[PDB]
Amino acid sequence: GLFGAIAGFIENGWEGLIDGWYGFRHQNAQGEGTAADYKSTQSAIDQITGKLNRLIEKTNQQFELIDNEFTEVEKQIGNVINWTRDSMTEVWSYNAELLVAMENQHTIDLADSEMNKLYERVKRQLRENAEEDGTGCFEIFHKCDDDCMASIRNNTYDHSRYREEAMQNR
Amino acid sequence: GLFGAIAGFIENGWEGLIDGWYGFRHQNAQGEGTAADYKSTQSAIDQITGKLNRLIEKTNQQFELIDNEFTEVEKQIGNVINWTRDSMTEVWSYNAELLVAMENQHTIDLADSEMNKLYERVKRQLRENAEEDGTGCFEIFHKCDDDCMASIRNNTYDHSRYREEAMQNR
Amino acid sequence: GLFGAIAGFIENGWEGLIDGWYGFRHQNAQGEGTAADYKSTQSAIDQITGKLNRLIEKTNQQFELIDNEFTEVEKQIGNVINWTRDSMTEVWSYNAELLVAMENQHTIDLADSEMNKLYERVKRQLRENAEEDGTGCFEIFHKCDDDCMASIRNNTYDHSRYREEAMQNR
Amino acid sequence: DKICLGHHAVSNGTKVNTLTERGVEVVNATETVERTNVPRICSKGKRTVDLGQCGLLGTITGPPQCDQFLEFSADLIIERREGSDVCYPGKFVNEEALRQILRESGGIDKETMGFTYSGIRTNGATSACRRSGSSFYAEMKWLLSNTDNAAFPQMTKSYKNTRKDPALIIWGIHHSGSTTEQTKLYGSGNKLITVGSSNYQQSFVPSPGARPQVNGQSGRIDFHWLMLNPNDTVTFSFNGAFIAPDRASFLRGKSMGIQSSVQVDANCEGDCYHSGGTIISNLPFQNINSRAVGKCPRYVKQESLMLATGMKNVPE
Amino acid sequence: DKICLGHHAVSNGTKVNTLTERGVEVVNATETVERTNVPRICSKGKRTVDLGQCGLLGTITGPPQCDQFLEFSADLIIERREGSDVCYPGKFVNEEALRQILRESGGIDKETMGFTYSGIRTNGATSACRRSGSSFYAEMKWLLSNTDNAAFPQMTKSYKNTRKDPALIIWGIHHSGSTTEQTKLYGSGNKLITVGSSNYQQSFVPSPGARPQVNGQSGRIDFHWLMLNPNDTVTFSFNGAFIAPDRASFLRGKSMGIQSSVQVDANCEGDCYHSGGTIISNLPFQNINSRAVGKCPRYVKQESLMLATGMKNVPE
Amino acid sequence: DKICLGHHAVSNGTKVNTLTERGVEVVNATETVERTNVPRICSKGKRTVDLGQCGLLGTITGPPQCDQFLEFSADLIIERREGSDVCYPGKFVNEEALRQILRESGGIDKETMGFTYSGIRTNGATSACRRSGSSFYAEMKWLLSNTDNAAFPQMTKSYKNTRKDPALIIWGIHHSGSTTEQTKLYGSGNKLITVGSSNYQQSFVPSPGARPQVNGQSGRIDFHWLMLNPNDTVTFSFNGAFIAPDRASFLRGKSMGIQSSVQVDANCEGDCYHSGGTIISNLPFQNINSRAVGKCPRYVKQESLMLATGMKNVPE
Ligand SMILES: CC(=O)N[C@@H]1[C@@H](O)[C@H](O[C@@H]2O[C@H](CO)[C@H](O)[C@H](O[C@]3(C(=O)O)C[C@H](O)[C@@H](NC(C)=O)[C@H]([C@H](O)[C@H](O)CO)O3)[C@H]2O)[C@@H](CO)O[C@H]1O
Ligand SMILES: CC(=O)N[C@@H]1[C@@H](O)[C@H](O[C@@H]2O[C@H](CO)[C@H](O)[C@H](O[C@]3(C(=O)O)C[C@H](O)[C@@H](NC(C)=O)[C@H]([C@H](O)[C@H](O)CO)O3)[C@H]2O)[C@@H](CO)O[C@H]1O
Ligand SMILES: CC(=O)N[C@@H]1[C@@H](O)[C@H](O[C@@H]2O[C@H](CO)[C@H](O)[C@H](O[C@]3(C(=O)O)C[C@H](O)[C@@H](NC(C)=O)[C@H]([C@H](O)[C@H](O)CO)O3)[C@H]2O)[C@@H](CO)O[C@H]1O
Ligand SMILES: *[C@@H]1O[C@H](CO)[C@@H](O[C@@H]2O[C@H](CO)[C@@H](O)[C@H](O)[C@H]2NC(C)=O)[C@H](O)[C@H]1NC(C)=O
Ligand SMILES: *[C@@H]1O[C@H](CO)[C@@H](O[C@@H]2O[C@H](CO)[C@@H](O)[C@H](O)[C@H]2NC(C)=O)[C@H](O)[C@H]1NC(C)=O
Ligand SMILES: *[C@@H]1O[C@H](CO)[C@@H](O[C@@H]2O[C@H](CO)[C@@H](O)[C@H](O)[C@H]2NC(C)=O)[C@H](O)[C@H]1NC(C)=O
Ligand SMILES: *[C@@H]1O[C@H](CO)[C@@H](O)[C@H](O)[C@H]1NC(C)=O
Ligand SMILES: *[C@@H]1O[C@H](CO)[C@@H](O)[C@H](O)[C@H]1NC(C)=O
Ligand SMILES: *[C@@H]1O[C@H](CO)[C@@H](O)[C@H](O)[C@H]1NC(C)=O
Ligand SMILES: *[C@@H]1O[C@H](CO)[C@@H](O)[C@H](O)[C@H]1NC(C)=O
Ligand SMILES: *[C@@H]1O[C@H](CO)[C@@H](O)[C@H](O)[C@H]1NC(C)=O
Ligand SMILES: *[C@@H]1O[C@H](CO)[C@@H](O)[C@H](O)[C@H]1NC(C)=O
Numbered sequence A, B, C: 001g002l003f004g005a006i007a008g009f010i011e012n013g014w015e016g017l018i019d020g021w022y023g024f025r026h027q028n029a030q031g032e033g034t035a036a037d038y039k040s041t042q043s044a045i046d047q048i049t050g051k052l053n054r055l056i057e058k059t060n061q062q063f064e065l066i067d068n069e070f071t072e073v074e075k076q077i078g079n080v081i082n083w084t085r086d087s088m089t090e091v092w093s094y095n096a097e098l099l100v101a102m103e104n105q106h107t108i109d110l111a112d113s114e115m116n117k118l119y120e121r122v123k124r125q126l127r128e129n130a131e132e133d134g135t136g137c138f139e140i141f142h143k144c145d146d147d148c149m150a151s152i153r154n155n156t157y158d159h160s161r162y163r164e165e166a167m168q169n170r
Numbered sequence D, E, F: 001d002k003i004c005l006g007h008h009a010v011s012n013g014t015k016v017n018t019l020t021e022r023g024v025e026v027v028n029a030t031e032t033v034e035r036t037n038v039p040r041i042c043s044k045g046k047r048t049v050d051l052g053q054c055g056l057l058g059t060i061t062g063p064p065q066c067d068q069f070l071e072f073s074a075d076l077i078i079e080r081r082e083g084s085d086v087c088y089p090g091k092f093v094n095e096e097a098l099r100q101i102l103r104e105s106g107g108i109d110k111e112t113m114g115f116t117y118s119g120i121r122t123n124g125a126t127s128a129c130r131r132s133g134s135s136f137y138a139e140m141k142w143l144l145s146n147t148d149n150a151a152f153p154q155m156t157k158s159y160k161n162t163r164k165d166p167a168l169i170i171w172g173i174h175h176s177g178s179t180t181e182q183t184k185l186y187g188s189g190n191k192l193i194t195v196g197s198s199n200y201q202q203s204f205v206p207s208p209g210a211r212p213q214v215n216g217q218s219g220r221i222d223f224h225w226l227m228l229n230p231n232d233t234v235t236f237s238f239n240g241a242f243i244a245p246d247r248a249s250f251l252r253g254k255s256m257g258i259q260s261s262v263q264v265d266a267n268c269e270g271d272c273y274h275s276g277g278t279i280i281s282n283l284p285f286q287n288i289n290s291r292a293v294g295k296c297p298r299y300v301k302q303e304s305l306m307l308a309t310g311m312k313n314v315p316e
Helices: A005-009 A038-055 A075-129 A146-153 A163-168 B005-009 B038-055 B075-129 B146-153 B163-168 C005-009 C038-055 C075-129 C146-153 C163-168 D064-069 D095-103 D179-186 E064-069 E095-103 E179-186 F064-069 F095-103 F179-186
Strands: A022-028 A031-036 A130-132 A137-140 B022-028 B031-036 B130-132 B137-140 C022-028 C031-036 C130-132 C137-140 D002-007 D014-017 D022-026 D029-031 D048-050 D076-079 D090-092 D108-112 D126-130 D140-142 D155-160 D167-175 D193-196 D201-204 D220-228 D233-238 D242-245 D247-251 D256-259 D272-274 D306-308 E002-007 E014-017 E022-026 E029-031 E048-050 E076-079 E090-092 E108-112 E126-130 E140-142 E155-160 E167-175 E193-196 E201-204 E220-228 E233-238 E242-245 E247-251 E256-259 E272-274 E306-308 F002-007 F014-017 F022-026 F029-031 F048-050 F076-079 F090-092 F108-112 F126-130 F140-142 F155-160 F167-175 F193-196 F201-204 F220-228 F233-238 F242-245 F247-251 F256-259 F272-274 F306-308
Touching: A005 A075, A005 C075, A022 A038, A022 A075, A022 A146, A031 A146, A038 A075, A038 D306, A038 E022, A075 A130, A075 A137, A075 A146, A075 A163, A075 B005, A075 B075, A075 B130, A075 C075, A075 D002, A075 D014, A075 D022, A075 D306, A075 F095, A130 C075, B005 B075, B022 B038, B022 B075, B022 B146, B031 B146, B038 B075, B038 E306, B038 F022, B075 B130, B075 B137, B075 B146, B075 B163, B075 C005, B075 C075, B075 C130, B075 D095, B075 E002, B075 E014, B075 E022, B075 E306, C005 C075, C022 C038, C022 C075, C022 C146, C031 C146, C038 C075, C038 D022, C038 F306, C075 C130, C075 C137, C075 C146, C075 C163, C075 E095, C075 F002, C075 F014, C075 F022, C075 F306, D014 D029, D014 D306, D076 D095, D090 D095, D095 D256, D140 D167, D201 D220, D233 D242, D256 D272, E014 E029, E014 E306, E076 E095, E090 E095, E095 E256, E140 E167, E201 E220, E233 E242, E256 E272, F014 F029, F014 F306, F076 F095, F090 F095, F095 F256, F140 F167, F201 F220, F233 F242, F256 F272
Parallel strands: D048 D076, D076 D256, D090 D220, E048 E076, E076 E256, E090 E220, F048 F076, F076 F256, F090 F220
Antiparallel strands: A022 A031, A022 D002, A130 A137, A137 D002, B022 B031, B022 E002, B130 B137, B137 E002, C022 C031, C022 F002, C130 C137, C137 F002, D014 D022, D029 D306, D108 D247, D140 D242, D155 D233, D167 D220, D167 D242, D167 D247, D193 D201, D193 D233, E014 E022, E029 E306, E108 E247, E140 E242, E155 E233, E167 E220, E167 E242, E167 E247, E193 E201, E193 E233, F014 F022, F029 F306, F108 F247, F140 F242, F155 F233, F167 F220, F167 F242, F167 F247, F193 F201, F193 F233
């Protein structure tokens, strides 16, 4: 996509993540752990949802028969009707091909975008207390236990607390 | 939006800013101060303007009457005309709904984008002389007076001058 | 564009680069050197290519004559046909103007995007071993010879090797 | 020591298309083009009239098979292939226009023209049009000369529309199989039938002559019509060969008319109909039938167009 | 110690719609669908002809109310509801086609056919068509037998178009109220009126018979027409019942024709017109009238479609 | 000390348009609107019939210039301006409908009606229709009274379609230059020509009268037609003035018909045709001709619409 996270600096997706669209895996003294992020997952879901509610629509626009399957109408008017109907088929087939291609390009870039947002939101929380791996990973200098991890997810992680020790560990 | 600044890492907008679309507030020894950024404001304005000049258009395409309000035309041809007109109403109503939705999605992401550009342009000026707050704020280690602030806006801010003192203040 | 690299923090393009769309110039002890990046260049090319293959199409949709250049049809039906044809000309002219404007906006932002991806991919490789100039330039603290440069392009550059010396050179 | 961001993925994704690419695999997607048809006319909650053997136009003139449809009332009118507008062989001039009027009519209400006659037969009949032996169109009268070969006296009959809505007036011209048959029914001489309104002007002549027998008759009755405006008059002046209306028709309101070959079903509701049935769908497009009528998804040529409802799928 | 980036916001934003959302609030927006109508025909700078009582088709035949419109010249032609094409009751065959030709004509120029006559009355008149007592169509001649019941001698009249543009030729067939009235005017016997060109072939017969009185007349005049090409000839052969053209018409150039119920106004300029007036707008769309003609914004069903002209509004 | 990222650029870029801007310069672009025409009919690999002097409708009746096109067979049919449907002056009723049928026919196959005659001339001819002296339509028969002024005996002829596809039946009504000429050919008295099917009902009368001479003839032959369904019968009953079909026509399959003024060329293949030639293009749009037919790019008003195929061009 445009933002370069999904099928980008992230190598690949996680078949193990079943609670959301985006999440975190960590490694620390106590072990490994995965968890879904509700906020990022919700924005994407709600937006894709909003798309569907616009498109899964049908008009209150009625049309009646202007020709006849049982007794053919006069040939000249018959051909003008067919020509017009075929002209409309062409227009709507184009519209529909484009609509869907345009929406899909955008849906994908929306997903790619929501990840990139989540990435950099965390980055900023950490400040000088961690560095950028490049594969979607944040290496932490100070050791960070499972309570310390849940505070990162919660957006309650206090960088100043662990700062001194992490900066000396540059 | 896609870039995640407006209704993103920035908490909210500033009703006090009346000189432009984007700007800076600072805090220093001399006091607080707000100022609009001409460049970022101009790019957004000019682009939204360019949109309007494409859409606020009308064709030189003339059409004449093919029916009659005073003396109804023959019913068969009358129904084909109505069917065709209604077919065109359907197409143009769709076109217009889509056009406006597509342009608005893009207009919003353009505004969100111009902010994110301005953010990171400043970030780069500062280099190791400041850190990222996360709320759209750049904490400066070295003390920076009102002349020092105007040089940031002007894009004349010399990072090397204040470097030594700011890096030691890590 | 939306990402702010091309006609953005990069001052301007390079007429000297003929092997690709994106690349690197470096400065070091041995001299200056330019080289095209195959990956970034390929993604843009393949995507713009994919666009052309969708649009450079033509329908298998046949239409026949419903009027006559040699012997004018009856005037009423003649006017309905012309009205309809002119209605279709209006629709397709609009479609085509929009399609091309929409695709071009996107093509430009795609190019701008692929650069910004390449930029930040390198940034991450370097980590604390270099700083951000702002003009699209990465200033390196440790001295880096032509073998060291080719490893950056190759994505084989080992940051940990040159780390100690570069961090002390903060 | 570290924390890592990621996104979900699945084993089996679903392919969609984009501006830039064909066959991009995404986590989930959903169809925008309807392919599923219901092979019935879904008529739940609608006043329906399935004409069966009765042809739409026959509801106005009244051949035997339309005896139960002379004053119907409907939201949805269903014409069938086996339907026929006539008993005695013939045709409506401007037939499709009238069908379109009737399909949208909501049904019809009838009133007598109040035409009386004297010194003529009023009761002409045929075996082509049978109701326990020979009969005729239930709304029409076959006007004849009293006795064989007798001259048909030059008549003038008139009807004013006293109603607030327009009336539908019908008449018929009879074309005998031979000139000698024409003289037998309405006396000799060139017959003129005149018809006029304030809105309308026309005239007619019969055309006796050999035709192939249809329902065992080589004669023909041409039916004609006009829409008489509120508080306007129509006058019929005729030498003979003339099939007079017994009643005038009035439109009840609004309806939708369709043509179909499948059954009615009151268990199923739908607003998009075609000859093969009903398209029940929320989707914007459909690839089932380009002549579907009602409130329909737009017809498109593509069999499928998948709309992504998930991110790009990138498995290991 | 610090510096902070931000964007503007307002107290009262304006809601718009997006691909993804309905009712997103943005700083400013502007309407793309026109709802404002001007209830006048904005005719500033245009040669205008408001036909009033004169019907468009009447400019060719010339009933009293069209006496001032026999050779008009125009950029914009305005038909009114009260307009009438006729004095003596009747109709044009192919009437809407001719109107379309005339609406786009730029006006008309006339030339005499140069038809002379002998041994007949040329001066037929009626009280239905009054100019200080009884008169007739100003461009037409009611041709009669010299005296009552006298036979109408078999005539042949011809006209060649010597001009570089096509000519508009008109004639009329007269249908008496009765057969006995027809014989009185043009003698007895079945009357044939023939009309031919190199491009065109047709024939006509009268149809005497009772009709409801319109302008106190139960007779009718059918008007017919054709477009004669440069350097082609038309021949009229007639037993009677025939209303001959006195003049031929030629189209001046280009115009636009409209139908309206509102006043002319030379203070206001516009190119998109409809019966209720003029749509003056730069906007691409309009929700005012789907039958607007001229150079119009496209008609759409939506009452409003707001185009964002500002960022998302995010107040505290 | 350092490394720098960059992108390419060119000296001379190409301007395109965007949602936001007009005239943005990009590295490279390509045209989406076709302006290049091939001034020939590109017929490579297609069974082509260029009618030249023969008019499409003339292939059914057979005037001299259509003698080589009586049973043609084609994928692509080309009508020319100089083409004419007739030798003896006249016209087809419903002419454009029939052309549309024939253009799409794939050609025609003929079979005899099997009509024999007795006690009449069958061999009428004219100098307007010459094949080494005077002749007639090759598929038609000009039926006359045996000798001058002799009465034309009241005939009835019939034809059943035994084929699985519909037949195309044609006949003609002859209108003499004068009433006295009509009596000479087919005896005096008002002539009636009747024509009926199970699907179709109509009647005709001649109309003798003066017309301008076309091909030195002031008479006219009106041609009529109908599509007879498989296993249905048509009956012709006629007092005279009647031009009988000698053969029936059947459609071979599928074709495309065009009108053009340029040459055929079998070196060039194309599916989008117009009077000025062929549009060979992969592009989605075209600004060459709005009446192009076949499989065409969509016609648009814009002369050019450039699609960017490169990044924004930013030189120093
Ligand atoms: C030589 C001989 O005696 N032959 C008879 C033969 O006439 C007869 O057929 C009759 O053919 C006439 C048409 O010429 C009609 O079709 C007769 O039927 C009816 C009908 O059923 O429609 C009878 C009906 O009462 C008539 N009604 C009126 C009001 O006139 C109609 C009417 O004349 C026609 O429909 C108008 O076209 O005709 C039919 O019996 C055959 C049996 O078919 O018997 C031979 O012996
Ligand atoms: C028993 C008796 O005497 N009754 C008369 C009655 O005839 C007369 O009405 C007349 O009715 C005739 C139609 O039959 C016409 O409508 C007469 O009017 C005119 C007209 O104004 O149009 C007079 C005009 O001079 C005539 N012109 C020509 C060229 O023929 C026309 C013309 O014949 C018709 O228009 C053709 O259809 O008719 C009308 O006076 C009434 C008064 O209406 O008085 C009774 O005593
Ligand atoms: C006073 C005198 O003798 N004058 C003749 C003059 O009649 C003659 O012209 C003739 O005009 C008639 C129409 O009235 C025809 O046009 C004659 O030509 C043909 C034709 O070529 O079409 C001859 C042909 O054999 C006829 N065939 C049949 C089957 O009838 C047709 C036919 O009658 C008409 O086409 C039907 O409308 O007419 C034509 O010679 C001139 C020479 O033109 O010579 C004068 O002396
Ligand atoms: C207009 O199109 C319809 C089909 O959409 C044509 O009708 C079909 O004709 C074919 C071949 O003649 C039949 O096999 C089908 O059964 C018909 N389908 C329907 C739905 O009617 C029709 O012929 C076309 N119009 C003209 C004038 O040819
Ligand atoms: C085609 O549509 C027009 C309306 O767009 C119909 O005309 C209207 O008819 C209604 C009801 O009969 C009247 O109340 C309106 O005054 C008419 N409006 C206009 C603008 O003419 C018309 O009837 C439709 N065509 C057919 C054949 O029914
Ligand atoms: C419908 O449009 C066509 C043009 O697209 C008109 O035909 C042209 O008429 C002009 C002026 O009368 C001629 O100079 C051209 O040669 C014609 N062009 C073609 C391609 O036929 C046509 O007149 C219009 N229809 C009506 C009823 O006016
Ligand atoms: C995926 O989309 C389809 C719509 O076709 C839906 O029915 C299905 O339940 C969806 N699955 C998930 C996991 O959302
Ligand atoms: C017909 O007459 C009645 C009163 O007798 C009136 O209510 C109605 O409006 C009239 N119709 C017209 C068109 O004048
Ligand atoms: C907001 O947009 C409207 C267009 O409807 C304009 O008239 C108004 O002046 C604009 N306000 C500002 C502050 O740009
Ligand atoms: C009619 O004749 C004149 C010369 O007398 C000529 O200029 C004009 O072109 C002719 N028209 C045609 C169609 O030949
Ligand atoms: C630029 O685009 C055109 C298409 O019009 C192509 O023919 C040309 O070779 C392209 N040039 C390059 C360098 O890709
Ligand atoms: C005509 O008759 C033949 C058998 O004689 C039959 O095959 C064909 O189907 C018939 N046509 C119709 C329409 O019944």
